[PDB]
Coordinates of C-alpha atoms in Angstrom, one line a residue:
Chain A
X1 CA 51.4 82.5 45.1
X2 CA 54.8 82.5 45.9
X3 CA 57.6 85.0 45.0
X4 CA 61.4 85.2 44.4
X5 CA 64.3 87.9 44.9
X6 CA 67.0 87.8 43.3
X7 CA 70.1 90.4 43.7
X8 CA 72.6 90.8 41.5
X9 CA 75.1 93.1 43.9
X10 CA 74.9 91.1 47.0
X11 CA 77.9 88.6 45.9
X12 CA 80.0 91.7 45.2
X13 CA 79.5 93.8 48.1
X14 CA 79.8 90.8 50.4
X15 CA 82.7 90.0 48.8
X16 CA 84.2 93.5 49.0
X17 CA 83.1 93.8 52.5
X18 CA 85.3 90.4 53.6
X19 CA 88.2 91.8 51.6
X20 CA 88.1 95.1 53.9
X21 CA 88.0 92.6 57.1
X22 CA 90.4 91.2 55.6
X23 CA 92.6 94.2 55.2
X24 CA 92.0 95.1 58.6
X25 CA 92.5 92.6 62.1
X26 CA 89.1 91.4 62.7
X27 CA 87.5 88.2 62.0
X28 CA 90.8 86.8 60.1
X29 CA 91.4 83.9 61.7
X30 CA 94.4 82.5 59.8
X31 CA 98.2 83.1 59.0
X32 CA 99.6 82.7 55.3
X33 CA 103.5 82.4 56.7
X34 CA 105.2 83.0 53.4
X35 CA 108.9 83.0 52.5
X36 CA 109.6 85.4 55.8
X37 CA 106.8 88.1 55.8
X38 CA 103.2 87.5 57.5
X39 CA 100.0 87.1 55.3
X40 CA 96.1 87.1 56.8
X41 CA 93.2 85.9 55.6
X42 CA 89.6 83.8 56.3
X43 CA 89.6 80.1 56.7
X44 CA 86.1 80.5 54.6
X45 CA 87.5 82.6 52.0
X46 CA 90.2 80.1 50.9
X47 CA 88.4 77.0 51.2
X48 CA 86.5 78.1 48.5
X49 CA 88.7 79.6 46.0
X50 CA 91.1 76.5 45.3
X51 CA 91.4 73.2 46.2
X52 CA 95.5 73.0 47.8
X53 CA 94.1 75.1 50.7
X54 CA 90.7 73.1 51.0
X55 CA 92.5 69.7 51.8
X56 CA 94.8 71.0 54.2
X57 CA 91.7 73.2 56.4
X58 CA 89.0 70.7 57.1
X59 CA 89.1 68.5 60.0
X60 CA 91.8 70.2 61.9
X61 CA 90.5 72.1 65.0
X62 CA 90.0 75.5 65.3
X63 CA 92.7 77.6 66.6
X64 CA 96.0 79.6 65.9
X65 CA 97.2 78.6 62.3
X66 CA 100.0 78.5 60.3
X67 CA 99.4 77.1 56.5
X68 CA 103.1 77.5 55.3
X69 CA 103.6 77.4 51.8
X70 CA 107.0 75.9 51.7
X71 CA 108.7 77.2 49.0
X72 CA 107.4 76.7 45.4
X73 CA 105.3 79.9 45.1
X74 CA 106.8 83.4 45.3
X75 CA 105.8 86.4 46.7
X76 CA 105.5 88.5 43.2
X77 CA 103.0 85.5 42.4
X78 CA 101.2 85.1 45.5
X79 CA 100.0 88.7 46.3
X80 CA 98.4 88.7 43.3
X81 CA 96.3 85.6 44.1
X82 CA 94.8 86.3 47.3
X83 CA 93.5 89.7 45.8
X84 CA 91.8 87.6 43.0
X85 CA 89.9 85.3 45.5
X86 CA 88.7 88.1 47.7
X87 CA 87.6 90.9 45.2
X88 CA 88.0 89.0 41.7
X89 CA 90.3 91.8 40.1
X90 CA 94.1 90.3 38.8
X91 CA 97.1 92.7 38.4
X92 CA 99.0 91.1 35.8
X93 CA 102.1 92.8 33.9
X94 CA 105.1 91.5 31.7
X95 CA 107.3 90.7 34.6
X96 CA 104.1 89.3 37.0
X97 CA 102.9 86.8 34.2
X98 CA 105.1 83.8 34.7
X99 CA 105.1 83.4 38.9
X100 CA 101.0 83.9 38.7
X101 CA 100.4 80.9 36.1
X102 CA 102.9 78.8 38.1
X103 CA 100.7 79.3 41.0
X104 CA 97.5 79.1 39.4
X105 CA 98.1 75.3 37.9
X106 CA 99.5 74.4 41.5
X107 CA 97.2 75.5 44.1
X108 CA 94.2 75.1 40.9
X109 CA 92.0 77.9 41.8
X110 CA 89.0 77.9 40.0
X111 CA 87.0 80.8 38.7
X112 CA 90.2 81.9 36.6
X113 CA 90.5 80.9 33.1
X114 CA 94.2 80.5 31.2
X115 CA 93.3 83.8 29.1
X116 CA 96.4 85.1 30.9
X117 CA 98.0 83.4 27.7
X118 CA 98.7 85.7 24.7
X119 CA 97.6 89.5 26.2
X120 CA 101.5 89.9 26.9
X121 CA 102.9 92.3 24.3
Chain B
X65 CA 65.4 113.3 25.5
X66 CA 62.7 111.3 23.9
X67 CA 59.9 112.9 21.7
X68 CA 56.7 112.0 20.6
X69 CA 54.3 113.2 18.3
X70 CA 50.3 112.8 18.5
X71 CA 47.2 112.9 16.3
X72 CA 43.8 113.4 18.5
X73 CA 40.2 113.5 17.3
X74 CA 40.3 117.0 17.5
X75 CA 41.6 117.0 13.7
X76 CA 39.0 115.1 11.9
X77 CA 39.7 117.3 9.2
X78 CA 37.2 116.6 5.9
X79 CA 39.6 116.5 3.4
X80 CA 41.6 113.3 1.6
X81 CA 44.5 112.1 3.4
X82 CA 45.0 110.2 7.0
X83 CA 45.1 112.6 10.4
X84 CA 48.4 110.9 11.5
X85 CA 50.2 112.0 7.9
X86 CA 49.3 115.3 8.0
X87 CA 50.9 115.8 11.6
X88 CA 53.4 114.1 11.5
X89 CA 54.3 116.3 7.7
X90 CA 54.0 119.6 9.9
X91 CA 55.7 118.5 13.4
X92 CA 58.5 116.7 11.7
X93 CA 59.4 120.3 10.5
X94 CA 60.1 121.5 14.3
X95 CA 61.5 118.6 15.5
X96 CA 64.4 118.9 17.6
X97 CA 66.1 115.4 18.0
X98 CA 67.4 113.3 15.5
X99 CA 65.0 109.8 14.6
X100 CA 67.3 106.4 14.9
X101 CA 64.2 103.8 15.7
X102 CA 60.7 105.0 15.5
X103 CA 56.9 102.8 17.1
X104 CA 54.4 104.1 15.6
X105 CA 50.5 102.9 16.1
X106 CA 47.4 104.0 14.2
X107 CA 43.7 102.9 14.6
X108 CA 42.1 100.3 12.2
X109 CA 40.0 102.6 10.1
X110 CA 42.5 105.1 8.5
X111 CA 44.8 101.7 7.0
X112 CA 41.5 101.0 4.5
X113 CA 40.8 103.1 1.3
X114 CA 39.2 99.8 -0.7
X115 CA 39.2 97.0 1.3
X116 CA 42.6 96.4 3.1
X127 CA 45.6 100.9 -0.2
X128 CA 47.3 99.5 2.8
X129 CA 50.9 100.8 1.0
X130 CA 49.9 103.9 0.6
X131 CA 48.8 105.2 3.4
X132 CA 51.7 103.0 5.0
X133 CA 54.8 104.0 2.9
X134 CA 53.5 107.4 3.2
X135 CA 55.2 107.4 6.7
X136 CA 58.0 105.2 5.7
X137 CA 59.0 107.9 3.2
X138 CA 59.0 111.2 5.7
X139 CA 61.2 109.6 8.0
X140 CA 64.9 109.1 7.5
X141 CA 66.5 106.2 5.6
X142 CA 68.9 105.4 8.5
X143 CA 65.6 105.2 10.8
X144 CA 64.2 102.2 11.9
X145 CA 60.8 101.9 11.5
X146 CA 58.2 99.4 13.3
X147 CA 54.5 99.5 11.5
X148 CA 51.8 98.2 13.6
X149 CA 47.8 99.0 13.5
X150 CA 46.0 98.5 16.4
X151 CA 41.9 98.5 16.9
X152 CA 41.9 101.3 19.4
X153 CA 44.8 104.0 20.5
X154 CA 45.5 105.3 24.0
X155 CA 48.3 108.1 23.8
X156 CA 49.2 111.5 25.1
X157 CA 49.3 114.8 23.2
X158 CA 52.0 116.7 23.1
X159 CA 53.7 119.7 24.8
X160 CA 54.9 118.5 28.4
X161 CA 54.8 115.4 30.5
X162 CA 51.9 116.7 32.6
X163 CA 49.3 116.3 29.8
X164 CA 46.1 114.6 30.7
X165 CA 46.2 111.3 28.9
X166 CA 43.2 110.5 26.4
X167 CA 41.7 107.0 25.7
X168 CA 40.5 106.5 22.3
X169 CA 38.2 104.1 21.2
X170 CA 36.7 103.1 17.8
X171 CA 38.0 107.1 15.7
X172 CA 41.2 107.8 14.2
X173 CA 44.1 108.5 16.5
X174 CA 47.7 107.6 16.8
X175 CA 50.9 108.5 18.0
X176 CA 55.1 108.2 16.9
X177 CA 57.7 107.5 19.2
X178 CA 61.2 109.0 18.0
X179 CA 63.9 106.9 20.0
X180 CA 67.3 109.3 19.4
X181 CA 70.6 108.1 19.6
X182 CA 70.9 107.3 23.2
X183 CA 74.8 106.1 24.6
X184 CA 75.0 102.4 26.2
X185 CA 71.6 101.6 25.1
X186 CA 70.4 99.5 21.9
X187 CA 67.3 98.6 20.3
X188 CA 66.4 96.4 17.5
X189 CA 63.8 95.3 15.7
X190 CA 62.9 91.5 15.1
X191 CA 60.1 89.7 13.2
X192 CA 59.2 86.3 12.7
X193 CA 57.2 85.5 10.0
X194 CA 54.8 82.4 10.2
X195 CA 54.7 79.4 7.9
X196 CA 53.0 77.2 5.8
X197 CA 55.2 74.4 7.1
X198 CA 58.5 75.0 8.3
X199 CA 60.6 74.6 11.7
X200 CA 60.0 76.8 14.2
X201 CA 63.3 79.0 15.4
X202 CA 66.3 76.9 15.3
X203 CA 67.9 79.3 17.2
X204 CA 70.2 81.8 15.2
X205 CA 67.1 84.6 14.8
X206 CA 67.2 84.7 18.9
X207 CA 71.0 85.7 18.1
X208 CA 70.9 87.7 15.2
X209 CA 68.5 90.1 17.0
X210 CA 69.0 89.3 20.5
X211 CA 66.8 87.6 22.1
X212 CA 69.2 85.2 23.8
X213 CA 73.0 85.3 25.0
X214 CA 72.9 88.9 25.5
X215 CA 73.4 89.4 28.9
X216 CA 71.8 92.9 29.5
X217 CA 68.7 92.4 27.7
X218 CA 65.5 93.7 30.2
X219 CA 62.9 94.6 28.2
X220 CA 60.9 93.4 25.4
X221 CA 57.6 94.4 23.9
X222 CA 56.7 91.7 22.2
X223 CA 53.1 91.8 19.3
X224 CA 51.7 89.8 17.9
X225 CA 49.1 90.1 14.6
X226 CA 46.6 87.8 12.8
X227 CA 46.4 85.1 15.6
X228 CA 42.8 84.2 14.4
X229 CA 43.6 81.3 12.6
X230 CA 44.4 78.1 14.7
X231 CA 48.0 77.2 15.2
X232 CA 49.2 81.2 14.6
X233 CA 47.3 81.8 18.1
X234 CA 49.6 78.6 19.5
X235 CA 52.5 80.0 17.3
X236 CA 52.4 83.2 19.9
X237 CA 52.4 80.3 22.8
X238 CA 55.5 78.7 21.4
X239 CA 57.4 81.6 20.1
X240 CA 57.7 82.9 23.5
X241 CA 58.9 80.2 25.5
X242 CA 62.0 80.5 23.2
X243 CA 63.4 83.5 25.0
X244 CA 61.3 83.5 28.1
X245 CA 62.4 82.5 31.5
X246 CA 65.1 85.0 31.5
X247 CA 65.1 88.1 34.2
X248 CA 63.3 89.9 31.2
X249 CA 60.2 92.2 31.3
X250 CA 57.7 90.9 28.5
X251 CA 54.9 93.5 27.3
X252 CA 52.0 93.5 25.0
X253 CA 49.5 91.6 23.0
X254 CA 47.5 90.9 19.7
X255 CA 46.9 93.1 17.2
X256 CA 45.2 93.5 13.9
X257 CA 48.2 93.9 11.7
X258 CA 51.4 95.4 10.5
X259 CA 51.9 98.2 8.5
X260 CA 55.7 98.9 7.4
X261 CA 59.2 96.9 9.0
X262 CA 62.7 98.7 7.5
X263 CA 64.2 95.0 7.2
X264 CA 64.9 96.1 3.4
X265 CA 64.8 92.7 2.1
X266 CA 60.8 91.4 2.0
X267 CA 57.9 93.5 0.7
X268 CA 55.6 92.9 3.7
X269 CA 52.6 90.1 3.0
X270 CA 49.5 91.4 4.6
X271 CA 47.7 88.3 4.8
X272 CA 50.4 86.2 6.6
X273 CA 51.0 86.7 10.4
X274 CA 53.8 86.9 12.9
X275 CA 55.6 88.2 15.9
X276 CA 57.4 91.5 15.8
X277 CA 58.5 93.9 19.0
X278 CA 61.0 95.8 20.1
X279 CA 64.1 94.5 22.4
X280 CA 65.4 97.2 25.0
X281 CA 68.4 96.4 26.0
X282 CA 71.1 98.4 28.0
X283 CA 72.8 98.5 31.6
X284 CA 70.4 101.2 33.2
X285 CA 67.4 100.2 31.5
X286 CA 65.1 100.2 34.5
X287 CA 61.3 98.0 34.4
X288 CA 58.4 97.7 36.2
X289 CA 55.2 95.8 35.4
X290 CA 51.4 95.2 37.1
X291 CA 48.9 93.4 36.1
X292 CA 45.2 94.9 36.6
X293 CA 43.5 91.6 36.7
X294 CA 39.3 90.6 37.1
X295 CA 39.7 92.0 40.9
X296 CA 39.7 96.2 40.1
X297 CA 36.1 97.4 38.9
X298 CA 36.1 100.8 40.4
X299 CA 37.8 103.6 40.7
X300 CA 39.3 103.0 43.5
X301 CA 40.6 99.7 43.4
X302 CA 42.6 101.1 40.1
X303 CA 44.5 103.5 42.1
X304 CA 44.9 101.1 44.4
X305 CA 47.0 98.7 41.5
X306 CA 48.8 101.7 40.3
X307 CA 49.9 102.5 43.9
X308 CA 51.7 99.0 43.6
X309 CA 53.9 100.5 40.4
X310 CA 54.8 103.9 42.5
X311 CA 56.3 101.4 45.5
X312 CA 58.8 99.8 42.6
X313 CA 60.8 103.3 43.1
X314 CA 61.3 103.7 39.5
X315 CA 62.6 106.9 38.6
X316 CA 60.7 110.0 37.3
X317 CA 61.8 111.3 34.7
X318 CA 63.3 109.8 30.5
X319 CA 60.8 107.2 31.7
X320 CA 57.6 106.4 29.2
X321 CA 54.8 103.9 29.9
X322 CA 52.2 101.6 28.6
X323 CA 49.2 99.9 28.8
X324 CA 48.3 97.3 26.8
X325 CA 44.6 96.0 27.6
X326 CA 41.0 94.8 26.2
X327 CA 39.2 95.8 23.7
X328 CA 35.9 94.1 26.7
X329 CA 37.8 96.4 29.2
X330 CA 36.9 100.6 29.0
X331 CA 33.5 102.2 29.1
X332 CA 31.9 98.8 28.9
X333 CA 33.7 96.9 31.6
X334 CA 33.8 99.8 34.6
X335 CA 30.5 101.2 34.8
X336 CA 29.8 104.2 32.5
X337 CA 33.2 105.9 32.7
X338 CA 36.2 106.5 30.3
X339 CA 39.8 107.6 30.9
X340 CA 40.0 105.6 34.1
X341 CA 42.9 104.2 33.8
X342 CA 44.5 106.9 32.4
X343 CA 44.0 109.2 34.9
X344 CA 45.2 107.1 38.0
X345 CA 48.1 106.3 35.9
X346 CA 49.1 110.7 36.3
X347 CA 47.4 110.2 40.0
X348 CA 50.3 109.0 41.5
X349 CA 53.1 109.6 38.4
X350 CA 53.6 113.3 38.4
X351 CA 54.6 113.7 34.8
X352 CA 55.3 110.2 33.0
X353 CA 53.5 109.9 29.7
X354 CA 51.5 107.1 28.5
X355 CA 51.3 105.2 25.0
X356 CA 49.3 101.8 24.3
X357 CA 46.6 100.4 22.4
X358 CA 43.7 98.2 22.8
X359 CA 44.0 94.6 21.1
X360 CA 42.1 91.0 21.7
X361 CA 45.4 89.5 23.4
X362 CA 47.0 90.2 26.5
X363 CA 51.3 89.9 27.4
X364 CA 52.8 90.5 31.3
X365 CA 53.2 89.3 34.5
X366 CA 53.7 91.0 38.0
X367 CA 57.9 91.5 37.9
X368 CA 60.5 94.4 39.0
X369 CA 63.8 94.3 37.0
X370 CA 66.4 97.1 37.8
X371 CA 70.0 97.4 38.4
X372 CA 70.1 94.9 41.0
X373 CA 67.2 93.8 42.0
X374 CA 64.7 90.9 40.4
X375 CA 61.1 90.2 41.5
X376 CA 59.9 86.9 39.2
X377 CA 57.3 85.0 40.4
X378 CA 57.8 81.5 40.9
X379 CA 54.7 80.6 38.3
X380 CA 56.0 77.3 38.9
X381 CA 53.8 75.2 36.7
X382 CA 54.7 75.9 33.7
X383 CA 54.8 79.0 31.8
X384 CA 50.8 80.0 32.7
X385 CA 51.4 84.0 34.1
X386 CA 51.8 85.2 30.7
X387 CA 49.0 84.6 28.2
X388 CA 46.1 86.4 30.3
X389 CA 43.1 87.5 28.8
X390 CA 40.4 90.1 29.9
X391 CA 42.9 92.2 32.0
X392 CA 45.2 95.0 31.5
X393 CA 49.4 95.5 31.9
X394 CA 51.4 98.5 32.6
X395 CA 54.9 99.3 32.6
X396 CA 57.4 102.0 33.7
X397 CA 60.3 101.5 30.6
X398 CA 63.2 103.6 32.0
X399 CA 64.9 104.2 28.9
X400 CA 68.3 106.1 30.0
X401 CA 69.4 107.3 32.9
Chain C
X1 CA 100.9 96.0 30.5
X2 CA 98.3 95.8 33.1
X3 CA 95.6 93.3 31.8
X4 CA 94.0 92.9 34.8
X5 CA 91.4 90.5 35.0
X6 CA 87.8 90.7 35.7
X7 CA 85.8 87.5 36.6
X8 CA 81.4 87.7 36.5
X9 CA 81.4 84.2 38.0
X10 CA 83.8 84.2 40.7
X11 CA 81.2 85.8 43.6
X12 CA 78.7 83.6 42.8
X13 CA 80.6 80.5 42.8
X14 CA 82.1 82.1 46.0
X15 CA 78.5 82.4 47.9
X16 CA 77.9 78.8 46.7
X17 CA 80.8 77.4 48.4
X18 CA 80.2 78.7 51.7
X19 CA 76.3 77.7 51.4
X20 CA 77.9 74.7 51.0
X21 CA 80.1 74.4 54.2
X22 CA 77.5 76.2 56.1
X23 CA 75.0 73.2 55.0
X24 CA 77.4 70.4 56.3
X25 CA 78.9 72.1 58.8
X26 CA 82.5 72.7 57.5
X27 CA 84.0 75.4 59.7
X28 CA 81.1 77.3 60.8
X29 CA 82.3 79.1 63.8
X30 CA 79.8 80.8 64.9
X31 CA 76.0 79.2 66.6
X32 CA 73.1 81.9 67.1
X33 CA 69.5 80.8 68.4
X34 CA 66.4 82.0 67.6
X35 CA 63.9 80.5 69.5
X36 CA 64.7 77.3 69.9
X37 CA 65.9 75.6 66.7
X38 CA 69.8 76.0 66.2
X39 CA 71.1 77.8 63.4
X40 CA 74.8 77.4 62.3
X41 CA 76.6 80.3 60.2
X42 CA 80.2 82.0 59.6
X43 CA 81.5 84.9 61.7
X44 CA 83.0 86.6 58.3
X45 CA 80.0 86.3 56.4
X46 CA 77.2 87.7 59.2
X47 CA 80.2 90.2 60.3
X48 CA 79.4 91.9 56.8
X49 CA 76.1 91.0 55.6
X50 CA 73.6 92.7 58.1
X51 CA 75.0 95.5 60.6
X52 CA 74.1 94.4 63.5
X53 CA 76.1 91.2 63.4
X54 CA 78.8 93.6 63.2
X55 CA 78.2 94.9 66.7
X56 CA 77.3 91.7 68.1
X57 CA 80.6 89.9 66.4
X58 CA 83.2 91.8 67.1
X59 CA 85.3 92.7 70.1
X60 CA 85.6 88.9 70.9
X61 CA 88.0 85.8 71.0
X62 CA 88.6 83.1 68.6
X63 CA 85.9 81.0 71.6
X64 CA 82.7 80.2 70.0
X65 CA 80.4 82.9 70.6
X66 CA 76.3 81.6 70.6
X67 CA 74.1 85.1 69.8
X68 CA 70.4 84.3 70.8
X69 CA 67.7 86.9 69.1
X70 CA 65.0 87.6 70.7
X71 CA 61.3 86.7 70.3
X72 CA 60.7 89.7 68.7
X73 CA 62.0 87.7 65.9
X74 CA 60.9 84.0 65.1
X75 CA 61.7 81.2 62.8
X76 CA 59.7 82.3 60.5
X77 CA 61.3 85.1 58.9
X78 CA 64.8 84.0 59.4
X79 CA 65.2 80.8 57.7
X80 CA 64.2 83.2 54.4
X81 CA 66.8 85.7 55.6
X82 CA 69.9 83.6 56.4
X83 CA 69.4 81.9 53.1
X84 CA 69.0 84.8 51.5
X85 CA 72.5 85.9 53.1
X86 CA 74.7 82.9 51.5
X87 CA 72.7 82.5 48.2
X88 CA 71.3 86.3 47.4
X89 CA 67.9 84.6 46.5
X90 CA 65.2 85.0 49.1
X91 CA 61.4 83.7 48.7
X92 CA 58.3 85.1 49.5
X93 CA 55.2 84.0 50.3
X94 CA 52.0 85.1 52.2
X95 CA 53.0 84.2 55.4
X96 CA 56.5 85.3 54.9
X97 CA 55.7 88.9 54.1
X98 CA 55.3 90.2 57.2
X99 CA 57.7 88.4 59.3
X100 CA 60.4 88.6 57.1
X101 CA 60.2 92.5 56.7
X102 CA 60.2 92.7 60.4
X103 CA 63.3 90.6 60.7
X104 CA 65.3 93.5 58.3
X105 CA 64.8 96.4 60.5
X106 CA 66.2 95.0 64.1
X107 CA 68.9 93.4 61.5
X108 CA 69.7 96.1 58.9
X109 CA 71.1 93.5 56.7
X110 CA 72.3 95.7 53.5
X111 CA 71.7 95.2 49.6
X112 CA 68.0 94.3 50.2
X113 CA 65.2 97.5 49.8
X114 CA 61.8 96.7 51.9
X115 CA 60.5 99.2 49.8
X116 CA 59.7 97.1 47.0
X117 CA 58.2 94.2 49.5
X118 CA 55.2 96.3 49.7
X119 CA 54.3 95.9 45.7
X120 CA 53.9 92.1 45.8
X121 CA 49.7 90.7 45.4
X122 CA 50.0 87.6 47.4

């Protein structure tokens, strides 16, 4: 005599919900310092999506951050990213394509499969 | 819009020819939607002329209705159905007499059905698994309903062949619904002239992405009148929509007039207590199919039944459910 | 030539995770009590996941902030709720009904209906 619930809109609404904190001030509680302009985001969000970000968060205390990527991503190639791994939606187009898969096999975020491969032209 | 079409007792006409046939001839004529898959269900008196004869009165429907139309023949030993006009009709249960009812499924956008049937064997495998795919069954990701029947379960190993069948596309966040039967009448599968004597699974397999379900099971525990309604007040909770939604009740041929104490139409009429103006359609058979389960849009309400698979196969009781077919 | 991808298995995989670092404590920021018997969580995820640790959550600093409930709510009907809000899964059972419905209300945690709670045999 015992029952289940199971949802099956939770995950997206949650994840919706983080991505409009995230869009606005509150509850971000770290700095993606990019190639000169300012970037915000969860230190929950991004340990989850890749791996580059996971072993560079944990064991550090908490406080101000800044998780500088140096200089081998891009801009055009990063925006894209961090709106995949907080509401699972890509914006790809014929002069996006090559900057996103160079990011994608470096910081080896999961969750995205290579069929970014032959939908060009 | 769905439409269905009724034969009641009150056209025991004494002349040669079945009561379903002759309605179905004159209503087909005012019909306003187009057949695509058709469930139809006749008692087990007016499938006999000699001693099965079975053809004839079964391609007799198979002929009326369109080529392109899917047809599923099965024969039941008792019919429970509502006549036609509106949706507030009083539904009528019909015990041993000839009755019967069609269900014409139109061409309905974003939701399929199919057919399947699995015929039994002398020796053979069991499903490897392609007929799963081939109909659907498996891998499909929006599959929510099934009614699932079974026939001719008399003979040892074809009553365990409906306890293994299942299992192959159970455990899913499905809705399973129905029974045992006596036999089946006519399958559009246009490649096997049906074998009366063998048995089998056949059903139908809802499937779409606003195909809404609900499901009780009216177990050993109601014997009155009130503790019926107090079942069906259960289904009304589930917040399943009114209306483009049909029902069913599957139950025992040891459940009716029998079983509650000198009354009939029992569970009928709490069924249009509560629902304002859903119709019902089912049939009495020796076998029993359901659980207690919500599937909707988001929502799923399994029950852990974490033995094996033993909240299916119940026997003695009665299941609803609350098929939402559209939106 | 926008493509744009569309991924059915990257929320799930999402919740896991932080199930996951909520389990072993890898940056949970946030400590709430209920009763006694500590409970360890994320601000983001409780910020967005009920509406009233909305209220409760925001309008502070980066300083660990330690919510206590009150005994209106217990143990009880929690543990099914907070695991419910990292894994969108929550059991039921007989003791559980009650409790756990009465948790929602004081909580208005969203995407759960306590309308079909009362169809259940049990």
């Amino acid at each position: 005599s015992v029952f289940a619930y199971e949802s099956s809109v939770h995950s997206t609404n949650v994840l919706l919900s983080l991505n409009d904190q995230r869009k606005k001030d509150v509850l971000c509680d770290v700095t993606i310092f990019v190639e000169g302009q300012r970037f915000r985001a969860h230190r929950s969000v991004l340990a989850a999506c890749s791996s580059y970000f996971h072993s560079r968060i944990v064991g550090q205390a908490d406080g101000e951050l800044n998780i500088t990527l140096p200089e081998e991503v891009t801009v055009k190639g990063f925006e894209p990213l961090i709106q995949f791994a907080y509401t699972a939606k890509l914006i790809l187009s014929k002069e996006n394509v090559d900057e996103v898969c160079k990011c994608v096999e470096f910081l080896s975020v999961h969750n995205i499969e290579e069929s970014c491969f032959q939908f060009l032209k | 819009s769905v439409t269905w079409i009724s034969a009641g007792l009150a056209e025991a006409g004494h002349l040669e020819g079945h009561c379903l046939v002759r309605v179905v001839a004159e209503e087909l004529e005012n019909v306003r939607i187009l057949p695509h898959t058709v469930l139809y269900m006749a008692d087990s008196e007016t499938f006999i002329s000699l001693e099965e004869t079975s053809m004839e009165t079964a391609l007799a429907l198979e002929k009326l209705f369109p080529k392109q139309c899917q047809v599923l023949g099965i024969v039941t030993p008792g019919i429970v159905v509502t006549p036609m006009g509106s949706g507030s009709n009083r539904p009528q249960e019909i015990e041993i007499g000839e009755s019967g009812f069609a269900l014409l499924f139109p061409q309905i956008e974003g939701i399929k059905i199919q057919p399947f049937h699995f015929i039994k064997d002398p020796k053979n495998l069991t499903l490897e698994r392609h007929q799963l795919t081939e109909v659907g069954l498996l891998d499909n990701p929006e599959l929510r309903v099934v009614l699932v029947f079974g026939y001719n379960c008399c003979k040892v190993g074809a009553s365990n062949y409906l306890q293994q069948v299942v299992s192959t596309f159970s455990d899913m966040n499905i809705i399973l619904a129905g029974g045992q039967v006596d036999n089946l009448s006519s399958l559009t599968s246009e490649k096997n002239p049906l074998d009366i004597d063998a048995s089998g699974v056949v059903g139908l397999s809802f499937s779409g992405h606003r195909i809404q379900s609900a499901t009780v099971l009216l177990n050993e525990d109601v014997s009155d009148e009130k503790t019926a309604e107090a079942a069906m007040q259960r289904l009304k909770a589930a917040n399943i929509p009114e209306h483009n939604t049909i029902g069913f009740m599957f139950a025992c041929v040891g459940r009716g007039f029998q079983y509650y104490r000198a009354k009939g139409n029992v569970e009928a009429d709490a069924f249009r207590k509560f629902f304002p103006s859903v119709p019902l359609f089912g049939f009495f058979g020796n076998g029993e199919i359901g659980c207690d389960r919500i599937v909707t849009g988001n929502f799923i309400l399994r029950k852990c039944n974490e033995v094996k698979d033993d909240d299916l196969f119940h026997s003695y009781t009665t299941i609803m459910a609350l098929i939402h077919l559209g939106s």
